[PDB]
Design a binder for this molecule. Structure first.
Ligand SMILES: Cc1ccccc1CNC(=O)[C@H](Cc1ccncc1)NC(=O)[C@H](CC(=O)NCC(C)(C)C)NC(=O)C(=O)c1c[nH]c2ccccc12
Ligand SMILES: [Mg+2]
Ligand SMILES: [Mg+2]
Ligand SMILES: [Mg+2]
Ligand SMILES: [Mg+2]
Lengths: 233, 222, 212, 198, 222, 204, 196, 198, 196
């Protein structure tokens, strides 16, 4: 028994040819109050993994602490902690999925939807979702909350199946993500103009971009709209 | 259901998908969701399917009578006012959510109406379960001063986003184009990207497979 | 579900249907509702399928354990009481079962115990259990006699389940028949209702509610 | 739970109706007749909710008698049972429905056939060789499925019912205090006023 | 209030032949009216020539498959690499399911392999551990659509010999793998047409006396 | 206790080459208790066939209502009602009771006496028309019926073949539903003649 | 929703954001919440969109009939018609209306009708879910007899704070200016008011 | 509802218990002995919730038999009932209470007196000349208030009992299938096998 | 309740009203809502009085034990102990706390721990039922690196507005000033702040 209090809306993500992209806005909502504005909802783990979290922010802060403990604990008595025995995205994911499912089974969930994005040591892209029920799935595109309803359809127009992924460049993928963040800001009442974005490339590594803004917004057409039916002036 | 309305520079277009459902089951794989209110005022609905239909026919009926009485072409704002006052009086219990569009002597018009009786005016709109997938496409690609061709394409892409991504939507795309110039053009099954693949086998039975108890000829006339 | 068992001159007749339902959905028509505990002991199943399957299979284990411990087959009284006491531990947790334990021992003679998830345990000569119980009762009770031949008693068993299979929406499929003697159950076959109904109508002149 | 049984043999219809009237923890009456004669060749039996039961029967009775006197003619059992159905089907959607189940047993003189109609409080009508309302049907339907024959005499019909009653007195939880049995044939309606201790 | 359960869609189908078994399932995963993924397998090679699916609530499904695969591992450790036969797997899965009798795994589960005599075998379960061996079984969302088709086309139910006046039933025969696979594809294209939670892809696992073989077919994506 | 489930009952209709078929089961139950083996759910007003599932009292009442209405239609119009028109009459009659609906799933089947083309239609309880040209299903085994029809059906079946397809669809759907079965009747409707057949089926 | 009306030297200005929501989905991002019921009598609507549209329409009709029989109605008269509708139907309505009008005898006036259907004449009024966040700000910054440029800025600043904190508010800011001069429609875009 | 009657005459206690076991719409049995002997001179009858009834009875029986063997002595009826009341009093506040009402009839050999205790599931104990559990007391208490005398013989008590069962057969809505009658006196417990037609 | 903490050039200031209610009754008009948990670490409490006191008492115990063993705790450490208690017990607590502290290294710091048990570091924070009315005002008037007197004025003005609109707020405005100096208690009476 519980209920989310301070919350953070969509996390959206996709695969491109050489890695993964993930983004989330910087807002912590308090019901319909847009209460906190500098909230990082992307969490780098090592330098091959970004965990994107939506839902309850207190539970998000708990999952942060767990992920940092995991890095510490992996480094213990491990001379290959920054090489062959570094934490892989799949390890980080399975761990969280275990936690999530155990917590729902005890009737005390972590009130979150989580996307783990990264690149494996064999160069393979990793993109997987887990939520408060312990439900897990993978897809060329993943999104939580509103993002599932609005971002996925736009992202899927780019990567509709597995074979579309060699064909998709960094530039096209980031372009699609950035556009989808704009659409979310247009239609999601709990979204923010400011967001963070992270690229995990098999060649580049980790690029973490903060303080990004939605630009090129269309508002001019508003002026022609008068009334709600018959009103002329 | 996915329904859209898009205003272009010389008129308005509406489009809809063609799947109707009974819970999780597809009842009709190609039902027409675009209803006519009058020759140049067309209508797409979501919610209770019997309600959108009935409210469309009732107002369509009264609009015709109005037009005969006044010797004028029906106006879209009239359909709107009649629809909203009817729906409001029924306090939501008539679950009709409609995108109404048409041309009349005062120009081209695009409105949405909700079950409780509220209306909004727009340049582009969507309703139904696929509404969010449709809007994503509209908000990405709409612009002022679209041509007839660009508007048909945009509306169609938006219904498609619904067909693919929304489980309550599928099958085909129906379009209707209302231009200030000519007649309205109803474009049935404009797209058909969901043809059932050829079956692997025929299930035609050898005659006499079914056991019969007794038989008789049934009479019709008198 | 319809299950029955009755004692007569020549032992015990056990007969059951074979339909599994989940709501109005027919889940199976070919299900086993009798558990062969040992060559002298039978258990029937009604209510929750899992609850029945699981606990009567468990019962067989406990009965076998008794044999190794006491160097003798468990009595009907004792076997039924194990299940009765187990089910009583779980009272109010929502177990759902209607059950008959039928068998022979020298000390007891042929014996029937009814056991259910409320904890009720009764020794008796005739029981019908399940949603179809009343239908089976109607035919069974109106044609029952202690002195029925084995042949007739097996037929009455078969016919009672058919009755319930016909009237109760939640019964049907096939009849599974058993005879329990001093020597001691014998299986008397599976009888599909699809064929049995028409066969019985023809040969008996009954089922006159049915057209054709 | 009130036993209302009907069985249609070759030349007659027999209705058997329980005699008990029970409110709460007391059997108030052990000789109730749950039956109204609708016309010389049509009998109705009824069970259900305490007040609705007799008020409905008597309202139907008054109406059929009125029809008889207006036309100097008896309505067929089929016609009577359609009237009753429509009445119940109206009642089910009104402010306070009659909660009453009925059997209609009549001998159609124009056809020279006995007829048994079963109608529940919803207005669900069906013609049957045998029928029952309430719990008692859960025993008798299967019983009659076995022992009933389409061409039985009235005397065989009465033996069939004896079996039905006996089965109900063995397996039904409540004491219904025996049945009143009535026969509808070509001659009309008579009462076998000697069934309970036969 | 926290609902510990959800519905991920999805349908599964198992058919037993004479010396083979198939277990099929669509690859779509859904939440409400949205699609989570178009390719997310739910039929698994569990080792020892046994395949398994547990369809319904995916989190309970994965938990169960995981737990069973772990049984197989430990069965080898504790009983000197002995092969876990299909009847033993079935019984074991009953205890896994019934262990959670009062907080059940919300899955319809099916396993397929070969019995001791090398005959194809299919076992199916309710959420709480009730089980039966069968010639065929459909589970999950479109189960009620497909099961009757299987009664008719696998066990030839309601089919008589023409001319016998419905006195001689159509004789039961084992089907070939080619004929079974046809029925599977046809069942899934049918289910895809009429059920909104079924589509995207079909994965079939075939089991014989040489291991586990896989086949994949595109399904409609609306 | 949901009214569409108290009595049980299925109806299916199919178009073929210059013919229609409509079939129903015969069961009338009350919950688990089977009550009558002879409850037919298909009716006909001239050459127009109506099948009705759901609450049996409403089935009887709707038939008595459409007998009434089509009789009066015939008297004023001096011709029999056609399938396309009757469909509209069913629809508006059901919508008339929008807030106290009949608990029914009606199905229309027939051939247009002028154009000669096969016509089927389905309705929900408040009169929404399902306009499928291939098949229409209704009742407590509708899910099963949808599965049978989608798999078994193909367009342009001859009357004699259509009989087999619709019969097998019905019979196998009925056997997976507790509240349907207990007999079935199939109407094969051809412009010129109609054949009624009683099917032999599982009596459980 | 964030709505407000402010009296000033030359008359009155009405302002509103443009967001309509159903749950967390923005159903309309460019809504027009400024509703004309007469030439120089306008209102702002909050609550049930159906209820406030049905009311504004009945009021529009009532004032049109008034004008035909009796000359221009006063702003008070327009407020009284709203109140009669909201008070008498209070059980069935979720309607919060701000009425504002210019008149030559009376200059600019503002009436607020909250949920129960009471009427309050005020120098300025604020309503809708967004208004809670700006009580302090507005009470601290409002002065009587401001100039047109000053009132526009007061409304621009107030509404941008409401939009910043209320998720149910957003979009563009719309204003209607009501003076002897005429009726002027203004609009302000996110890139303009977010900077303030 | 389950008839449980007791009457204490001068030299014996008579227990009478109904024979029906009814679940739902079916009488599963018509020969159920709702009794356990606790010791040679103490008998207990019981009624209530389906499983609890026999489980409680047998548990009590086990405990009294254990005492008897440990002490080679028979507890007085007063002592047995005190022990029974305690068990019930603990039960009512536990996780799942035994829903069982009992009558205890004993012959006290040390005093040479018959003794009748009535205890409900809450652990309410009272010593009475006659008692009943359930609805049956709503008829029998007043009847015995009229007919009962403290100096009656065992044969007078059996007549008084016959009168009680006749009334319940006449007025009770349920068919309880007659009673099993047991007499407790100095020479122990015996069953009167003839009552259904004595 | 209206509570706030503001960082400034020389440290941090906490302010609060003094009203506690049960329903519409003022149970205490002179409450002290500013709670010391260490010499230069203070907090403001909102929500359940029982809960927040029990929490503040436990934190004070942890910080006293901390100081015995390890030296002065940082403000962050204080905030973390509050979170631990609020997060881990989220299902029996209704507690919103603002933590404010000064140390020589980190200067003045503010943390807010709202209902869920999340932690947020902020240049200034506002909480309690009265705060909703001053989001607009505070956002517009807060600047970083203000002087003592400016900050005192900002809190005074902010809370006077919160008090003006919130029925659950009122009485006296209390403040605690936290700097190197020094701990300074300030109080302001209605006759001063209402006239602002
Ligand atoms: C005693 C017996 C023994 C063996 C075989 C048959 C019988 C006759 N009994 C039944 O048929 C009962 C009827 C009943 C239904 C509900 N209540 C009480 C009784 N059915 C069940 O217990 C079914 C069985 C089932 O569907 N088994 C699957 C199988 C083995 C036929 C393939 N399970 C279910 O319906 C079932 O598990 C559930 C259905 N929905 C659920 C949601 C959450 C958890 C569990 C379920
Ligand atoms: Mg094995
Ligand atoms: Mg599909
Ligand atoms: Mg049956
Ligand atoms: Mg105050």
């Amino acid at each position: 028994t519980q209920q989310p209090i301070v919350t953070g809306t969509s996390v959206i993500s996709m695969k491109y040819d050489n890695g993964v992209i993930i983004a989330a806005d910087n807002l912590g909502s308090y019901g319909s109050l847009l209460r906190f504005n500098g909230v990082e909802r992307l969490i780098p783990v090592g330098d091959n993994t970004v965990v994107g979290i939506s839902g309850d922010i207190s539970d998000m802060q708990h999952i942060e602490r767990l992920l940092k403990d995991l890095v510490t604990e992996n480094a213990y008595d491990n001379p290959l902690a920054d090489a062959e025995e570094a934490l892989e995205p799949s390890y980080i994911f399975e761990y969280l999925a275990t936690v999530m499912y155990q917590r729902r089974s005890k009737m005390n969930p972590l009130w979150n939807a989580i996307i783990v994005a990264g690149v494996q040591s064999n160069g393979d892209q990793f993109l997987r979702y887990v939520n408060l029920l312990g439900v897990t799935y993978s897809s060329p595109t993943l999104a939580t909350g509103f993002g599932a309803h609005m971002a996925n359809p736009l992202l899927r127009k780019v990567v509709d199946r597995e074979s579309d992924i060699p064909k998709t460049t960094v530039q096209v993928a980031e372009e699609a993500i950035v556009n989808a963040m704009r659409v979310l800001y247009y239609r999601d009442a709990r979204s923010s103009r400011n967001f963070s974005l992270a690229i995990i490339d098999k060649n580049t590594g980790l690029t973490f971009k903060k303080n990004l803004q939605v630009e090129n917004m269309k508002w001019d057409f508003a002026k022609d709209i008068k009334g709600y039916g018959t009103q002329k002036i | 259901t996915t329904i859209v309305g898009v205003k272009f520079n010389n008129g308005v277009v509406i489009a809809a998908d063609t799947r109707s459902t009974q819970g999780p089951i597809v009842a009709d794989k190609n039902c027409a969701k675009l209803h006519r209110i009058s020759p140049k005022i067309w209508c797409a609905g979501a919610g209770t399917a019997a309600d959108t239909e009935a409210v469309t026919q009732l107002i369509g009926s009264n609009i015709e009578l109005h037009s005969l009485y006044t010797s004028r072409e029906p106006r879209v704002v009239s359909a709107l006012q009649m629809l909203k006052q009817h729906l409001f009086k029924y306090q939501g219990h008539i679950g009709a959510y409609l995108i109404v569009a048409g041309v009349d002597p005062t120009g081209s018009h695009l409105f949405s109406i909700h079950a409780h009786g509220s209306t909004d005016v727009g340049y582009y709109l969507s309703l139904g379960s696929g509404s969010l997938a449709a809007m994503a496409v509209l908000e990405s690609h709409w612009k002022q001063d679209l041509t007839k061709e660009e508007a048909i394409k945009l509306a169609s892409d938006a219904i498609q986003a619904g067909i693919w991504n929304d489980l309550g939507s599928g099958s085909n795309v129906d379009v209707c184009v209302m231009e200030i110039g000519k007649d309205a053009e109803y474009l049935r099954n404009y797209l058909t990207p969901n043809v059932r693949e050829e079956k692997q086998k025929s299930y035609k039975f050898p005659r006499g497979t079914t056991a019969v108890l007794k038989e008789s000829i049934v009479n019709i006339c008198d | 579900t319809t299950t029955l068992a009755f004692r007569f001159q020549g032992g015990i007749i056990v007969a059951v249907d074979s339909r599994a339902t989940a709501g109005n959905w027919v889940a199976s028509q070919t299900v086993k509702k009798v558990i062969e505990i040992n060559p002298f002991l039978l258990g029937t199943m009604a209510g929750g399928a899992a609850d029945c399957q699981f606990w009567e299979t468990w019962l067989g284990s406990q009965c076998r354990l008794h044999e190794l411990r006491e160097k003798e087959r468990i009595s009907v009284a004792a076997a039924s009481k194990i299940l009765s006491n187990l089910v009583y531990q779980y009272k109010g947790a929502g177990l759902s079962m209607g059950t008959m334990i039928c068998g022979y021992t020298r000390k007891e003679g042929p014996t029937i115990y009814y056991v259910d998830s409320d904890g009720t345990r009764l020794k008796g000569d005739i029981f019908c259990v399940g949603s179809g119980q009343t239908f089976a009762y109607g035919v069974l009770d109106s044609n029952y006699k202690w002195d029925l031949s084995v042949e007739d008693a097996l037929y009455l068993g078969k016919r009672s389940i058919l009755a319930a299979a016909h009237r109760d929406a939640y019964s049907g499929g096939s009849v599974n028949l058993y005879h329990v003697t001093e020597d001691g159950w014998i299986y008397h076959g599976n009888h599909d209702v699809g064929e049995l109904f028409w066969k019985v109508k023809e040969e008996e002149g009954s089922f006159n509610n049915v057209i054709g | 739970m009130d036993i209302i049984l009907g069985i249609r043999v070759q030349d007659s219809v027999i209705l058997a109706s329980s005699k008990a009237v029970t409110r709460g923890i007391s059997v108030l009456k052990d000789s109730d007749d749950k039956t109204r004669q609708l016309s010389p060749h049509t009998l109705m039996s009824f069970a259900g909710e305490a007040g609705d039961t007799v008020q409905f029967a008597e309202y139907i009775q008054a109406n059929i008698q009125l029809y008889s006197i207006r036309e100097d003619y008896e309505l067929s059992p089929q016609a009577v049972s359609s009237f009753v159905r429509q009445e119940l089907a109206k009642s089910i959607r009104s402010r306070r429905p009659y909660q009453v189940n009925v059997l209609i047993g009549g001998y159609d003189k124009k056809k020279n056939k006995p007829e048994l109609y079963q109608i529940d409080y919803l207005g669900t009508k069906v013609e049957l060789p045998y029928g029952a309302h309430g719990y008692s049907g859960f025993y008798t339907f299967s019983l009659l499925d076995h022992h009933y024959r389409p061409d039985m005499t009235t005397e065989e019909g009465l033996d069939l019912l004896k079996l039905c009653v006996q089965e109900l007195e063995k397996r039904m939880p409540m004491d219904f205090k025996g049945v009143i049995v009535k026969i509808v044939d070509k001659d009309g309606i008579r009462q076998v006023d000697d069934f309970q201790a036969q | 209030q926290f609902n510990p359960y959800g519905d991920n869609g999805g349908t599964i189908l198992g058919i037993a032949g004479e010396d083979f078994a198939v277990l099929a399932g669509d690859t779509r995963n859904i939440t409400d009216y949205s699609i989570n993924s178009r390719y997310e397998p739910k039929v698994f090679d569990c080792g020892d020539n046994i395949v398994m699916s547990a369809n319904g609530f995916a989190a309970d499904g994965d938990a169960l498959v995981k737990r069973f695969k772990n049984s197989v591992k430990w069965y080898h450790f504790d009983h000197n690499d002995k092969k876990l036969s299909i009847n033993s797997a079935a019984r074991n899965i009953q205890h896994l399911l019934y262990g959670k009798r009062f907080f059940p795994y919300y899955v319809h589960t099916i396993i397929a392999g070969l019995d001791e005599d090398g005959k194809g075998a299919v076992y199916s379960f309710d959420p709480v551990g009730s089980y039966e061996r069968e010639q065929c079984r459909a589970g999950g969302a479109a189960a009620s659509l497909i099961m009757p088709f299987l009664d008719n086309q696998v066990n030839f139910k309601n089919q008589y010999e023409p001319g016998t006046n419905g006195k001689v039933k159509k004789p039961l025969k084992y089907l070939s793998v080619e004929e079974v696979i046809k029925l599977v594809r046809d069942s899934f294209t049918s289910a895809t047409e009429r059920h909104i939670q079924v589509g995207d892809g079909l994965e079939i696992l075939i089991v014989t006396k040489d291991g586990v073989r896989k086949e994949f077919y595109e399904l409609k994506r609306d | 206790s949901d009214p569409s489930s108290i009595n049980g009952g299925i109806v299916v209709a199919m178009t073929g080459k210059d013919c229609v078929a409509i079939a129903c089961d015969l069961r009338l139950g009350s919950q688990s208790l089977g009550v009558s083996n002879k409850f037919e759910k298909i009716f006909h007003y001239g050459h127009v066939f109506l099948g009705i599932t759901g609450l049996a009292t409403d089935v009887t009442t709707l038939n008595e209502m459409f007998r009434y209405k089509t009789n009066l239609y015939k008297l004023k119009e001096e011709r029999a009602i056609e399938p396309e028109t009757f469909t509209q009459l069913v629809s508006s009659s059901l919508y008339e009771r929008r807030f106290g609906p009949y608990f029914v799933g009606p199905v229309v089947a027939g051939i247009n006496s002028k154009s000669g083309k096969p016509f089927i239609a389905g309705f929900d309880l408040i009169g929404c028309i399902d306009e499928a040209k291939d098949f229409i299903v209704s009742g407590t085994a509708s899910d099963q019926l949808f599965g049978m029809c989608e798999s078994l059906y193909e367009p342009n079946l001859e009357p004699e073949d259509l009989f087999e397809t619709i019969s097998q669809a019905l019979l196998n759907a009925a056997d997976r539903d507790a509240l349907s079965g207990w007999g079935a009747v199939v109407y094969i409707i051809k412009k010129d003649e109609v054949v009624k057949r009683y099917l032999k089926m599982r009596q459980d | 929703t964030s709505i407000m009306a402010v009296t000033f030297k030359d008359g009155v200005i009405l302002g509103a954001d443009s967001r309509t929501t159903t749950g967390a989905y923005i159903a309309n991002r460019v809504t027009d919440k400024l509703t004309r019921v007469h030439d120089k009598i306008w209102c702002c609507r909050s609550g049930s969109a159906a209820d406030t549209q049905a009311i504004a329409d009945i009021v529009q009709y009532h004032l049109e009939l008034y004008t035909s029989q009796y000359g221009t109605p006063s702003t008070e008269t327009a407020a009284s018609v709203f109140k009669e509708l909201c008070y008498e139907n209070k059980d069935n309505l979720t309607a919060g209306i701000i009425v504002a009008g210019y008149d030559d005898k009376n200059k600019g006036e503002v009436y607020t009708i909250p949920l129960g259907g009471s009427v309050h004449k005020l120098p300025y009024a604020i309503a809708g879910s967004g208004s809670t966040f700006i009580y302090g700000y507005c009470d601290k910054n409002f002065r009587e007899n401001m100039s047109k440029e000053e009132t526009v800025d007061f409304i621009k600043h107030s509404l941008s704070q409401a939009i910043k904190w209320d998720g149910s508010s957003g979009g563009v800011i719309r204003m209607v200016v009501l003076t002897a001069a005429g009726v002027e429609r203004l609009i302000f875009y996110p890139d303009e008011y977010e900077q303030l």
